[model samples]
Target chain A: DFVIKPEDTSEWPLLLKNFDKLLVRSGHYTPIPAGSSPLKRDLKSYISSGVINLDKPSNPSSHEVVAWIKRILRCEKTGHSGTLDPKVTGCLIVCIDRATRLVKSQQGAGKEYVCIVRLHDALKDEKDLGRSLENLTGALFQRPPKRQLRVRTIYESNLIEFDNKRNLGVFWASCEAGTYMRTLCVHLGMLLGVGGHMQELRRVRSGALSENDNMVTLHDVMDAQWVYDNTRDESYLRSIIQPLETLLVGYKRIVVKDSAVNAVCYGAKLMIPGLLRYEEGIELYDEIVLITTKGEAIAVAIAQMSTVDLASCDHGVVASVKRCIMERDLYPRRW
Target chain B: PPDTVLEMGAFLHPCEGDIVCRSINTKIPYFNAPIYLENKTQVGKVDEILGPLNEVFFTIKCGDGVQATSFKEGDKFYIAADKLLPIERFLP
Candidate 1:
């Protein structure tokens, strides 16, 4: 009996469905003997193409944390999706080995933070605080500390709590990828006719990744690695590290036939003939991922044809491979 | 004339021996692309791209025998686009 049955591959698609709806183009089943599933990979290959949704500890810079993870996993290289200041702590997406290429996907994703703003002057009307926060909710022009000015949007902003005696206000904000929370506090103070600065900041979300999703601390990773090294029990480590495909949840997907897998590994463009099914509503030039029928990501690509146009046309280039992640010769060349 | 020249942005100031600059364009050149001054003086290579995509900023790690003081605020830097590669080259 197979310990991990092919039907056990239901979790990934279900997680993807939570983000966007999937559309079927052709009915095709993946051959079991060809390419192995992502979860069933060996220890070496797993760590090579893995992602860790790390719960960063305050006081260490993002680069320092990445270096620690690289050493713990004994991998060649590791990189983080976005930089978090030394003092700020929360979800930090760390990619190991070949998975470093996927950092750009999460780099451009939206961010959410909960921060404490310390006001310079006390005794402002409580109503004014809410009004000022509302004013800061929409589009804003922010200039980073010692940087040029640019437009950044605040998707949502709310005043969580306020303490007049301490002149501290806890606020939450969901913003575009690069919006500066420190500068945002300054703007709020200006709007309220007072001066303020960000006292503490913590990121709760980055695009599809949130603090609630399999986030682990550096100690947890170290312990897990140690256990795997001594006892050969990888359950703890596997639970903490995710497949590289986890980061591509934000992009629409196209599932290719098994025969087309090797071509993508060799840097060939994805043609219509190899296509099996794709998500609906994908437009031209939209960032999308190419996956095999087994639910492993092959490459991140740019869509050449819209979903509606692709439905009508029978044969042509469907997408151009932007970053190929899969290794060569995994699937025999059938093109 | 070669079409490979890309104007990065105006030099801001030095930070711990590295030269910082503000980016004027959204297209990010590949890492380690040679950076040059207006007079074609080779300064260094791109060290990192920071900030949000809309408000892109980059720092230059000075080459050997180069000093951060050599660059002035508001000085422009360019990269030979030919030295950069498509995004796929950096990926697995």
Candidate 2:
């Protein structure tokens, strides 16, 4: 009964869906009296461990937007995945309360943006511009607007729309995290001998989250919170605020038995005996999440043994707990 | 000066040689900003911001003559809230 059936994975994000769960040990399902499901958490608990894929509006700094969310939710704490400049807008991941611990997971994830670059000088040929942008693709040595030089990869770059008359070009770029778009625009301008600068920029994707993933605006959050506070209807609010576990979608995960839940919560290393199943393709020393059979994240661990190594061993330490997420005493200690 | 001070977060505990605090102001880029205690005692600079987007943990690199153990858990930290100028400010 303790199994990750195909149907159980249907609703998973595409990244998580791609990996097949490999069974490390087979065991019968035992009913646990403690620790409720993440999705089934009550309002208070949900707010404490919730994540919002906020559609950040322009004008306010990323810090200011997070402050307003803190006031709106009346929560003690709130944090965001990355810093979007004051004039930039779009997909900002805001975590509330306990979910802030998960921000580190997104810090290094890749980003995608659509920007309007205004060329100071009109281009003579669109072909030259296209060819120049193509040249900018792949690894690039870009200096931050006010910082030291670093190599940032541009996965893909395209000139979506070019208006020679107005000297405005709409460009889309997918790049590694921390790549500055304003600096990128200047580089393109410098390459073509026509000075350019980013007019308007919008982030479409940040790590595993994107604009398509229920990116709600501040007003939407305000409205939902108002409705929930006045009518006590959580449906709309719940739709906007997702469970924190959703952030762990793209990361490799291991599912442990109920008997192992309490020990992991207390920062104990996960042994092979407690392991039930794990996602394939996990490498040595990779950061992975340890979860319950019901899909609640218990702790993040560093794999002591890879998937192939775990399959062959009958008994040994599988992973060392790095950060304990779930509170202690949630489940009865079996070992 | 009181109005110019921004409330960061409460001190959590000492980690290694750095001071860890539960961040309240994650939106602002406070990296390298000088951190202070309630009495305006300069403790350290924000070494790093750790954890998730919503609730963050700040690791402080204690300044000269500062002791990590001198601070206790739940002690509030603050930073001088300088008005953030836009890109134009940096321009000639």
TM-score of predicted chain B versus true chain B for each candidate: 0.78, 0.78
C-alpha RMSD (angstroms) for model 2: 17.3
Angstrom error of the Cα, residue A331, model 1: value is 2.2
Each candidate: fraction of true contacts kept? 0.00, 0.00
lDDT (Cα atoms) of all candidates against the true structure: 0.77, 0.77
Model 2 residue runs over 4 Å out of place are A1-21, B1-92
Interface RMSD of each: 11.4, 18.2
Residue pairs of candidate 1 with colliding backbone atoms: none
DockQ of 2: 0.01
DockQ for each numbered candidate? 0.02, 0.01
B1-92: candidate 1 lDDT, tens digit per residue: 33456788678766556777777654666567788876677789986554433454567889899987777878898887675544333223
Query: Model 2 Cα displacement at A331 (Å)?
Result: 2.9
